[PDB]
Amino acid sequence: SGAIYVGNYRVVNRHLATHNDWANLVWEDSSRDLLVSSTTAQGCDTIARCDCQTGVYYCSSRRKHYPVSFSKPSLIFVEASEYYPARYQSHLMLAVGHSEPGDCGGILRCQHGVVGIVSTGGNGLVGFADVRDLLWLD
């Protein structure tokens, strides 16, 4: 679990969005596993606007932050799940690191701000949904 709070927006994994997120929908994209909903209170976070390929992510299944090197945002094949059929997930960045399904929503940050959130994983892999291209967030 986890979300980004910027301005009057809340950014979450689309597959974890609540009834309230859908009732206050701003934008969603199944191909990116992202959903943005509106909030009444002002948000705490800054979004990075950079091309960093190194950063730190929070891993809830270890209660720890880990440093990572990650690939540039791209179209990557993701196996069928309870939430989506087999498809290419876009704007996804992969890195070598530990992750489990419940780690989705953990923030990836660089020196400039929030880069994205955990969205996929594998055997010693972790994938992040990029948010740096969503200029309208701030």
Could you list the residues that contact Zn ion (CB under 5 A)?
48, 50, 52, 110, 112
Binding letters toward ligand A1B52, positions 97-116, x by CB under 6 A: --xxx-xx------------
Both tokens of residue 18?
């609540």
Place of tokens 């701000």: 113
- Residue 110 labelled as part of a binding site: yes
- Which among 91, 103, 104, 130 is annotated as catalytic? 104
- Please answer whether residues 1 and 105 qualify as being in contact, where contact means their C-beta atoms are separated by less than 8 angstroms: yes
Binding letters toward ligand A1B52, positions 41-70, x by CB under 6 A: ------------------------------
Closest CA to 49 of 129, 116, 94: 116
Beta bridge partners of 44: none
Contact partner at residue 110 from ligand A1B52, Zn ion, none, CB < 5 to 8 Å by partner kind: Zn ion
Q: CA 76, CA 88: separation in Å to the nearest integer? A: 5
Contact partner at residue 52 from Zn ion, ligand A1B52, none, CB < 5 to 8 Å by partner kind: Zn ion
State the nearest-atom distance from the C-beta of 40 to ligand A1B52, in Å: 29
Closest CA to 132 of 76, 50, 67, 35: 50
> Which residues belong to the annotated binding site for Zn(2+)?
50, 52, 110, 112
